[PDB]
C-alpha cells in the first residue's frame, strides 16, 4: 500500500506542467492530438487533462523511503 495522500498538490501540478512544457518545447512527441496551440504549456495542460503525461512523481518521506505515484492515478483538481 501507499500511505500518502491521493490528491495531487499544487506543487506537483506546477512542476509536472513545468517539466512537461520544457519537454514539449524541445522536439519530443506529443501524447495528445494538438489542434494548433503553439505554447508548450497549453499542450502540457491538454496532456494533463487527458491523463497522458509520462512522469512518475517520486514522493520522499523524510526518513529516506519513497513512493512512486503516477501522474494519471492521482486525483487532479483545480
Amino acid at each position: 500500500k501507499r500511505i500518502t495522500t491521493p490528491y495531487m498538490t499544487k506543487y506537483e501540478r506546477a512542476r509536472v506542467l513545468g517539466t512537461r512544457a520544457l519537454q514539449i518545447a524541445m522536439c519530443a512527441p506529443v501524447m495528445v492530438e494538438l489542434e494548433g496551440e503553439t505554447d508548450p504549456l497549453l499542450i502540457a495542460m491538454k496532456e494533463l487533462k487527458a491523463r497522458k503525461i509520462p512522469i512518475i512523481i517520486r514522493r520522499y518521506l523524510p526518513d529516506g523511503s519513497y513512493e512512486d505515484w503516477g501522474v494519471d492515478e492521482l486525483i487532479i483538481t483545480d
Binding site: I24, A25, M26, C27, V30, L34, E37, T38, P40, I43
Partner: protein, 99 residues
C-alpha cells in the same frame, strides 16, 4: 550594501520594467496591459519545435520594429546571437531548424 544583503540574498535582475499605473476595468482580473514600448524590449526565448515553426517564421519576418516580432536569433549548438535588424530576415526565416 554588503554581499549578503546587497548582492547575494537580493540582486538586480534584468528582463524587468517599471512604469506608472492607471486603471482599466475592461480587462479581466488576471490580465495586465503592457505598453508597446516595453513589449518590444522584454523578450522571451521561444524554442523552435514542430508546433510553432510557422508562427515563429512570421515573427522573424516582421522583425524588430513591427510589434509581433523578434529581436534576436540563435542557432542550435552556437552561443552567439545574430541581431535581427541587419541582414535579410526572409532568409533567416527559411533557415530555421528544429532546436
Amino acid at each position: 550594501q554588503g554581499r549578503f544583503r546587497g548582492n547575494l540574498s537580493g540582486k538586480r535582475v534584468d528582463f524587468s520594467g517599471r512604469t506608472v499605473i492607471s486603471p482599466d476595468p475592461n480587462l479581466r482580473i488576471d490580465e495586465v496591459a503592457v505598453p508597446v514600448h516595453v513589449a518590444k524590449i522584454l523578450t522571451f526565448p521561444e524554442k523552435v519545435n514542430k508546433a510553432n515553426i510557422n508562427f515563429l517564421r512570421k515573427l522573424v519576418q516582421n522583425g524588430p520594429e513591427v510589434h509581433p516580432g523578434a529581436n534576436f536569433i540563435q542557432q542550435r549548438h552556437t552561443q552567439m546571437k545574430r541581431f535581427l535588424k541587419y541582414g535579410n530576415r526572409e532568409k533567416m526565416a527559411q533557415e530555421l531548424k528544429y532546436g
